[PDB]
Design a binder for this molecule. Structure first.
Ligand SMILES: Cc1cc2nc3c(=O)[nH]c(=O)nc-3n(C[C@H](O)[C@H](O)[C@H](O)COP(=O)(O)O)c2cc1C
Ligand code: SF4
Ligand code: FES
Lengths: 148, 493
């Protein structure tokens, strides 16, 4: 039921102007990544070539090339969040899970996002569509508690 | 009693959800009216979970309400530990002019009634009576300029776009604030979203466009939904203007904030920055003229045209005119947002208004702008906030981002992070950012080692980056480095 979903998605975005990006968003949202078995149909329905459909997928970071773990943990690494000790939070958390920055697994996936808008709340994280701020060395406990 | 629990990310992050839960629970356990509201953020994030309660005198605010402190309510609002009194009467909220973010945190964002009651839809319903040229001249009289760059008068831009023939022109809002410390757009689109709708409709009626777009990031998942709901709700109010706008979500690239790369990403291609023989105004989205502007610039348009351009020109210095929001984050006691006229010294903004630091330590650095901005120390406290003077005193002021670092910060780490950023965030179109950044990131490590053949090397690298790079992601990246090096030499061996 992959071709079906993909065809439905493409039908949903038929006639738009520059509809590649939205189509790719929807694809990623459906499966979890942009499968190489879905570079061709998109290109065909949009009149592009596999090459461009691959280049677009490569340029952008939000488009996964392979799936992530059951959970995901994005952790800002920008100036503000760095200021109020993001490094410490990072260390504590990666020791808790045992996965360094960028190092993924089947359980989780620790990565950087470089901003969330929570600059005032300097230490900021995104755990499974849930934003968290003021991440002290204690909040990490609950971060991992609800996150097996 | 009426309860106003923010629905912003700055509140949801701090646990406004738990506050809601505890409140509802305690109300179910203690019989009461239990009227809850879901307004936005007032712009004071050091107490963002503020539980404003209605009273005949006004609205009394509460501190960073943790669910543990919720039980304290329903007993006495006067004998409460976290008492702020009239939220409007706080010296942090009083000193703000607060025009653009006027109706942000005191209304339900997706409530048309409260919006219309707040002088909303005035700019639009006033513009349609006017002509495409009158509106442009209004905008130009005020000299609003550019809020996401060096500052280019938007009047001239609108003029250039208008004096260009095509079957279908375009308009784009570049809300892709990947810069650090910059969270004004997020607030303005998560609170008072209809302001953007109104401004864009006005701009489209002015320039001569019928189709419009708004480019949101992916790191702002709440704002996206809010704006979608706004666009879907204001469809009737958009019909009268002859304007159909759609939201377009980014895909995780800081370089897609550049006009060219932005409209290149809109087109379905990969966001590589274009050269500039043609300007996006002349030839942009699908080769058709497009007016591409920032949100703060398209949030003042309605105000400017309605409340009178002559009023908006009153605020500011000789060259820079109008009010700007100053976003203050990082290590700082009272963070958040301060909307005010130019000419203010960051000394006042960082030592008096927002106290000092959260750690209680002094401040060694104050970075205006994002990571494309110099590191201004305590000594520069005598430098007022305006484009010309800051751009004159070896720096940059863009989206008014403002972070703070205390004495326990290492400038080496930050100068390295600058290049690391310029490296990870890079389209790869021109060499001075492709290779320059990933080589500077090595040169900085070498400097850390102790080599002396690195510093002059670094200077030359930075200079070629400045003078060669196609865009500003690799033409202003040198500024953090050079500033951290010339201001804080006691950290760079
Ligand atoms: C790397 C880079 C990132 C940018 N990011 C933004 C941004 O997040 N928001 C913005 O309004 N302008 C941003 N700009 C500026 C745009 O080039 C353009 O000036 C802006 O969309 C117009 O806003 P105005 O109405 O203030 O002129 C960025 C420029 C560069 C080079
Ligand atoms: S400086 Fe870097 S990001 Fe900017 S155009 Fe050149 S390669 Fe692209
Ligand atoms: S910088 Fe990490 S919150 Fe915006």
């Amino acid at each position: 039921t992959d071709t079906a979903r993909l065809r439905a998605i493409l039908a949903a975005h038929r006639g738009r102007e520059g509809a590649l990006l939205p189509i790719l968003h929807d694809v990623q949202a459906a499966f979890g990544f942009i499968p190489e078995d879905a570079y061709a149909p998109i290109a065909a329905d949009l009149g592009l070539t596999r090459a461009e459909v691959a280049g677009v997928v490569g340029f952008y970071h939000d488009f996964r090339k392979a799936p992530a773990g059951r959970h995901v943990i994005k952790l800002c690494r920008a100036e503000a969040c760095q200021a109020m000790g993001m490094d410490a939070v990072q260390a504590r958390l990666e020791s808790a899970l045992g996965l360094r920055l960028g190092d993924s697994s089947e359980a989780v996936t620790l990565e950087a996002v470089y901003c969330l808008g929570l600059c005032a709340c300097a230490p900021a994280a995104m755990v499974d569509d849930r934003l968290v701020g003021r991440l002290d060395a204690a909040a990490v406990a609950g971060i991992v508690a609800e996150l097996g | 009693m009426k309860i106003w629990l923010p629905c912003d990310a700055a509140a949801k992050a701090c646990g406004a959800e738990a506050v809601l839960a505890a409140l509802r629970l305690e109300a179910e356990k203690r019989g009461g009216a239990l009227d809850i509201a879901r307004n936005g953020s007032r712009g004071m994030i050091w107490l963002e979970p503020l539980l404003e309660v209605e009273t005949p005198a006004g609205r009394i605010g509460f501190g960073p309400m943790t669910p543990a402190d919720v039980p304290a309510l329903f007993d006495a609002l006067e004998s409460h530990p976290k008492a702020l009194g009239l939220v409007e009467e706080i010296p942090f909220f009083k000193r703000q002019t607060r025009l653009t973010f006027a109706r942000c945190g005191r209304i339900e964002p997706l409530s048309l009634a409260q919006f219309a009651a707040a002088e909303g839809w005035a700019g639009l319903r006033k513009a349609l009576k006017m002509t495409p040229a009158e509106v442009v001249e209004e905008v130009l009289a005020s000299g609003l300029r550019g809020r996401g760059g060096a500052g280019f008068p938007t009047g001239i831009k609108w003029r250039t776009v208008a004096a260009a023939q095509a079957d279908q022109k375009y308009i784009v809002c570049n809300v892709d604030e990947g810069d650090s410390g910059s969270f004004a757009d997020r607030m303005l689109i998560e609170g008072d979203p209809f302001c953007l709708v109104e401004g864009m409709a006005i701009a489209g009626h002015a320039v001569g466009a019928t189709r419009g777009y708004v480019y949101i990031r992916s790191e702002y998942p709440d704002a996206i939904a809010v704006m979608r709901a706004a666009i879907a709700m204001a469809k009737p109010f958009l019909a009268e203007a002859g304007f159909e706008m759609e939201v377009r979500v980014g895909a995780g690239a800081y370089v897609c904030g550049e006009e060219t790369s932005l409209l290149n990403s809109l087109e379905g291609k990969r966001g590589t920055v274009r050269a500039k023989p043609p300007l996006p105004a002349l030839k942009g989205l699908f080769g058709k003229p497009t007016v591409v502007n920032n949100l703060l610039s398209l949030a003042a348009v309605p105000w400017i045209i309605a409340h009178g351009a002559k009023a908006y020109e009153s605020f500011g210095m000789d060259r820079s005119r109008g009010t700007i929001p100053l976003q203050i984050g990082g290590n700082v006691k009272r963070g958040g947002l301060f909307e005010t006229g130019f000419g203010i010294t960051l000394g006042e903004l960082v030592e008096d208004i927002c106290g000092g630091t959260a750690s209680g330590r002094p401040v060694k650095a104050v970075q205006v702008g994002g990571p494309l901005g110099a590191y201004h120390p305590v000594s520069d406290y005598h430098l007022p906030f305006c484009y010309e003077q800051f751009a004159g005193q070896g720096g940059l002021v863009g989206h008014a981002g403002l972070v703070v670092h205390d004495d326990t910060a290492d400038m080496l780490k930050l100068a390295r992070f600058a290049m690391e950023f310029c490296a990870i965030e890079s389209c790869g179109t021109c060499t001075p950012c492709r290779i320059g950044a990933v080589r500077g990131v090595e040169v900085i490590d070498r400097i850390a080692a102790g080599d002396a053949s690195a510093m002059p090397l670094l200077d030359d690298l930075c200079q070629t980056m400045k003078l060669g790079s196609l865009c500003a992601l690799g033409g202003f990246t040198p500024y953090p480095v050079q500033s951290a090096i010339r201001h804080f030499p006691a950290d760079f061996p």
